[PDB]
A paper describes a structure:
The type II AAA + ATPase Drg1 is a ribosome assembly factor, functioning to release Rlp24 from the pre-60S particle just exported from nucleus, and its activity in can be inhibited by a drug molecule diazaborine. Here, we report Drg1 structures in different nucleotide-binding and benzo-diazaborine treated states. All structures display a typical three-layered architecture, similar to those of type II AAA + hexamers, such as p97/VCP and Cdc48, and the NTD, D1, and D2 rings show an apparent deviation from a perfect sixfold symmetry. Comparisons of these structures indicate that Drg1 hexamers transit between two extreme conformations, a planar and a helical state.
To obtain possible hybrid nucleotide bound states that best mimic the ATPase hydrolysis cycle of Drg1 and to illustrate the inhibition mechanism of benzo-diazaborine, we also incubated Drg1 with a mixture of ADP, AMPPNP, and benzo-diazaborine, as well as with a mixture of ATP and benzo-diazaborine. Taking the dataset of ADP/AMPPNP/benzo-diazaborine as an example, we performed deep 3D classification and analyzed the conformational differences between its planar and helical states. While the NTD and D1 rings are roughly superimposable, the D2 rings display a very large rotation between two states. While the six subunits in the planar or planar-like states are arranged more symmetrically, the subunits in the helical states adopt a spiral configuration to varying extents. Benzo-diazaborine was detected in the six D1 ATPase sites of the planar state, which is more symmetrical, whereas all the ATPase sites in the helical hexamer show no trace of benzo-diazaborine. Therefore, it is apparent that the treatment of Drg1 hexamers with benzo-diazaborine led to the formation of more symmetrical structures, indicating that the chemical also directly modulates the conformation of Drg1 hexamer, in addition to the inhibition of the ATP hydrolysis. The nucleotide binding to the D2 domains was only seen in structures from benzo-diazaborine treated samples, including the ADP/AMPPNP/benzo-diazaborine and ATP/benzo-diazaborine datasets. While the six D2 ATPase sites in the structure of the ATP/benzo-diazaborine dataset are fully occupied by ATP, the six D2 sites in the structures from the ADP/AMPPNP/benzo-diazaborine dataset are not saturated and appear to be partially occupied by ADP. In sharp contrast, in the protomer of planar benzo-diazaborine bound hexamer, the linker is in a loop conformation. Especially, M503 in the loop conformation is released from the hydrophobic interface.
Numbering used by the authors:
A (entry chain F): 261 to 520
B (entry chain E): 29 to 205, 220 to 776
C (entry chain D): 261 to 776
Amino acid sequence: IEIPLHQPTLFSSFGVSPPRGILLHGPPGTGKTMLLRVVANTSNAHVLTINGPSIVSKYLGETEAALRDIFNEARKYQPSIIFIDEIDSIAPNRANDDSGEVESRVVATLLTLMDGMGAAGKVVVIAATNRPNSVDPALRRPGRFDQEVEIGIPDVDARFDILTKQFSRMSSDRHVLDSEAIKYIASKTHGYVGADLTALCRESVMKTIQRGLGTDANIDKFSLKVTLKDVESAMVDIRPSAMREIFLEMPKVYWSDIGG
Amino acid sequence: KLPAEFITRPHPSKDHGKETCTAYIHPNVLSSLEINPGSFCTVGKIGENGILVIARAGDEEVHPVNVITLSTTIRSVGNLILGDRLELKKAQVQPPYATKVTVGSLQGYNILECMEEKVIQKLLDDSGVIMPGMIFQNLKTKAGDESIDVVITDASDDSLPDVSQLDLNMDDMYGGLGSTHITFSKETQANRKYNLPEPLSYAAVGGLDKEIESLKSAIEIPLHQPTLFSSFGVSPPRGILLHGPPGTGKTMLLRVVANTSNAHVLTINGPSIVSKYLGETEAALRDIFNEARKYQPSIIFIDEIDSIAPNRANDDSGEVESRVVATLLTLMDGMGAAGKVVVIAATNRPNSVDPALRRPGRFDQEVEIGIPDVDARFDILTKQFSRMSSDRHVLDSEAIKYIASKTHGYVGADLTALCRESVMKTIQRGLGTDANIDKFSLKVTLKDVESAMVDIRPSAMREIFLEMPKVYWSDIGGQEELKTKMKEMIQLPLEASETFARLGISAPKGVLLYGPPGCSKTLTAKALATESGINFLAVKGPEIFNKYVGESERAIREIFRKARSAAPSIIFFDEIDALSPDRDGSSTSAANHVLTSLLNEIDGVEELKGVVIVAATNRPDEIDAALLRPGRLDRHIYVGPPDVNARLEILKKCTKKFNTEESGVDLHELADRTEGYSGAEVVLLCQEAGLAAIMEDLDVAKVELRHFEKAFKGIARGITPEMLSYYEEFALRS
Amino acid sequence: IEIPLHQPTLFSSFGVSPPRGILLHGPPGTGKTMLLRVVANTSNAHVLTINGPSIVSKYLGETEAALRDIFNEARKYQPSIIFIDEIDSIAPNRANDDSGEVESRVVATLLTLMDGMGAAGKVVVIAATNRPNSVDPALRRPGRFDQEVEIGIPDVDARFDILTKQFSRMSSDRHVLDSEAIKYIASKTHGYVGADLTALCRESVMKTIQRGLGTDANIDKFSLKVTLKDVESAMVDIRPSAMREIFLEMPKVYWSDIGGQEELKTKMKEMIQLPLEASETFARLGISAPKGVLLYGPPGCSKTLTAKALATESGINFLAVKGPEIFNKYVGESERAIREIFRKARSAAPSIIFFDEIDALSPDRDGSSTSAANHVLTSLLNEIDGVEELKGVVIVAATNRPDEIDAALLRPGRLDRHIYVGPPDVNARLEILKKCTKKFNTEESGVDLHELADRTEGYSGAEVVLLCQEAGLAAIMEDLDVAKVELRHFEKAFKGIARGITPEMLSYYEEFALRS
Ligand SMILES: Nc1ncnc2c1ncn2[C@@H]1O[C@H](COP(=O)(O)OP(=O)(O)O)[C@@H](O)[C@H]1O
Ligand SMILES: Nc1ncnc2c1ncn2[C@@H]1O[C@H](COP(=O)(O)OP(=O)(O)O)[C@@H](O)[C@H]1O
């Protein structure tokens, strides 16, 4: 996001032209829009976002006119950011189904608009999809969308870091928990996704609320705070759903445990 | 009236006139814009703010409202091809003045001095002058004829509004028949900081020549010399199909041929013409046809015609379907008698195209655009790098050839993407390492290119035909008998087709290779593709197999027609003992259908004298006796295990990295002990010995004999006399 | 087309009324549009043509009103002719596809309008379709379109005629082509449609233009004109479209080419001479014709090119249909193809239908086969002699393995004749070797063509041809072109090649012949 925008003259000196596409893909809980929000909040450049189905209209030319208008508006302001969410639904695979209406017409017009806005400029288009297979292979071409980044499920290290950052928001004043308990929870959490970790946090907060209520008749929440037991209850009653995975991060084991 | 968009038109009568600010607009349009004609006008071309502010004049009511004339100079500067829609808007405020003004003298060595004779007066005598970009004809200046064009990019004028597309300037002269502090300075090309559109030229396209001259002829014959063809009375063709794998630059070729052609060009946006009521599309297409025919020279482009005109039997969705196909074929068939009109259709796959379109009456001309070869990729790389210039990269010819040799499965778009992400990698390696150092010194190297190819992840690996890597006879270790025989059966066809025709012998066009699966079969196939240098199509056994019934039939038909239409060549099968065995393996009906189709292709009511069919098998008796019929696949080569000489040569080649003198190996005792092994076995033994040597004390300059002998203990022979006797008895019975 | 228009009263006097619908069908590019255009040009009476899909509109009543107005205009002017283009698209099959909207409703209104538009009048309706099968059966009923015109792919004579006519339009000034070149082109172009020939001529002119521009540097195009050099590359790069067809005709091959046994030749000559000049004798006697001859023998020769020899000698159109090519992935497509070929054979005068192989479709019990093969075999059995008996056509079957034909097909009354057609004898092999060595010089080589045949007894005719081919290759690989092939090369090739035929299969064939 920084190379093609912050220094457009340096890249245009080569004349190879900068890429005009960033692809975010992976399973849910990968912080796709979160990344979109982060860059938009951080970068002072103008940002444009689409609502998805709201742009979709029954008329044949209304979508084309809206896309042209938003692209011309982005080109008018030199610092511009383009947001394209649920691109897979917006641009379904041509071979998978010939649904019609919102179909290859909009794909062709959008690729034409993002292929020739100018010589160098500074324009970036970010597309987020749930699955790259369902994405139209015309979209998944090196001519238009050569640059992609892969986002996967967090590992033991990454999952532990996410849990620690989430807890660090409530802070010690809210709860008391050592790093050993956090590491144990991260090791226990294997098939969960990024959103699943926040689901566990909310379920633990719930379980704490009802336990405190039914135990001490609406006592102050600060005394009970957050402990382990409600966390394990949340893991038991959370019904994990992202267990299926192409690759499995089996818990590690050292040579000390090895008998051979 | 209320005209929203206008179509460009070349300025006629040449001469001088005004030549920069003609703008022969209808007086009604002049009054509708609420601006006096004696002022600036603007042309849009669907966007591109600034809108190309150019002064305006009036016509003689002959010029219709739809078309507008704005001179070939501005047409080229704005890269305005014919048929595009131009928007009219109000004029912009007058720019202050011009500062430097500098000529470039393109496609020339400059330093003309005497030949100049005050070109400044001729250049600046014209009104308008959109400072950064003009081109002019050489005209008639003194003696020495020839032609030159100038580049007027260089300037040092600053304009507050950046909305203007090309920030035009004003003029102030002092002379008859002195600028601002001279104008002649250097022969620089178009400046990059202006970000002006680049006019496509044929020098950018590489590796596509052999059919580009045919395309040039097929476009030039009707549009430029139609009287000669009309005198014959066979009527001029109107349609040419371009097809091939994606990423071959079909659209770029169409754009460059449109830019080079000075006649009217018409293009469509693709499927967006599709609308409701089933009448708007018909009205639009008939309007496009009427516009193309109204002006005597015209060219029509059709893009992704497969989506517009899918196969009728394939799908029956409705709406825009075979009805529009019928109306367009009727329009094209009887649009004119002689005329000068050509329609070009671009499709990703010809099979999906409606067979009605693929008819001699409409699209009798077919152009094959395949993946670039080694030579084409070499030229494509040299071409981008030559344009790239050595000021931004340091890589010699051998590095380019080495990269091109490594790149096999890529396509034209893949190379450009690889270069772009190589630039990305170079920028990253500069910034993140040297903390924002000057990028001029580091520039482009080989390591970043190699890493870029490692991380490119190409998506064009699956191909119907594969260009298997070449290898010269020096690296080949084998028996002289098989090499001489193969040289004989490749020398007979190419330089003895006429002898066969005179004598009636023709060619067997069938050679069967059977042997041990250790080595020599594919190695002999390689020598044959490098040595002769003739077209080679590597076809593997399991890869033609498809789960869908009939897809393999289409694949084999396509490869056979490609071989037939791609000059004399050789067809090699890596493993033929997979499709052949059906009675023993109880194969499905698909295998039997494939066998029957290939038999009918090789020796059914047809003869393929140009191409030679060769096959390699591991188990020869499993091939059905129908294939082993006289007249087809008659040649048989034992090509068994390599002899002592071939194994010795292979060992010497593999040991070249190590030092034999320090180790003391005589390169003869090792070969004497290594008799029952194969070439692949010898290579594996050498690799294991090298691994054992390098795991002792890290890097070693030689491999020891003890390591080789330990590898000899640690490996199995892998060959059994029973299968050798099986091969021998198959040879005897044949 | 002349009997309803010029003389309507003569036909109406009978009271049966003249037909109004003429159907033109055939492969694409045959020239149905040419017939439409030429009848439009040569006729001085009013005609009406349709725009096809243009009449089709969103409104259901708009098409009906347009058709009614067209018919009213046609009937108002007493001499009228109706032209229909692509009737299949306008009138698809109800059974195949229920598209809806603009569909067989228009078929019903069209048939209603055209059944009682007039009593005598002078009106004829010409409809051209690409494929007759897709046309709905309502239009394909003798009530409206009983008269049909079949326009198949041009044969060698028709191709020669069109090339002679095609060249005349270009004229001798534009191209120097003689009769021999035209005949050679017609012989080479076997499976080509009429459109393909004109396209080949046009791109031959194109190749001439490129050659002239490349070589002569923009010389006058009339000097180079048209020769056979560009025509060769024309056949090379024409990219034909009529390769897949069931009307493949082998090139004519005379008796001198085939060296075989006189007994088999006499037998097949008698078999072909019985029907053509003894149909009346069969009718008087009631014997009729066996209409079935079985060709079983070793996978050598004399059982496949004998069909070509028969076609050349008799001068009768033959149906050279390969075995495996009738098999199709789609279920029932083979039945459609075989029924179409039977209809064409019946419609194309008394002819002879030859099968390249039958040992693949026939086996259903000995080897595992799909139900489609059994259905096709049952259909063939019902067609050959089941309830329906065909007189003019004669069916001959050639097989490479005899036991694969089931007893249901091998039933008395059909395919009764059996021919051993074994390996060629001494005289046949000697004649084949003499023909093969005709190009070479036997006197210089010193061979008498008799000892070679004496040594070459266990081989076949095709085996002998391959032996001569490889012997010539061995003769020429030494010093390029040679004027003769030596005996040493002959004997070296004799070591190099093997017959590949075992006595066990000959004994099996003899055993099968004994039981028949
Ligand atoms: N020096 C080498 N380096 C890398 N690959 C090689 C080398 N020599 C041969 N090969 C590969 O090994 C293969 C040998 O095939 P081969 O075993 O002869 O086929 P078959 O099993 O049918 O006999 C060839 O396809 C070739 O690509
Ligand atoms: N003397 C000859 N010269 C050239 N070709 C021949 C000669 N004799 C036979 N042939 C060819 O050999 C083929 C023999 O076919 P055959 O192998 O009997 O069919 P199948 O494989 O069904 O048994 C014929 O198609 C014929 O064209």
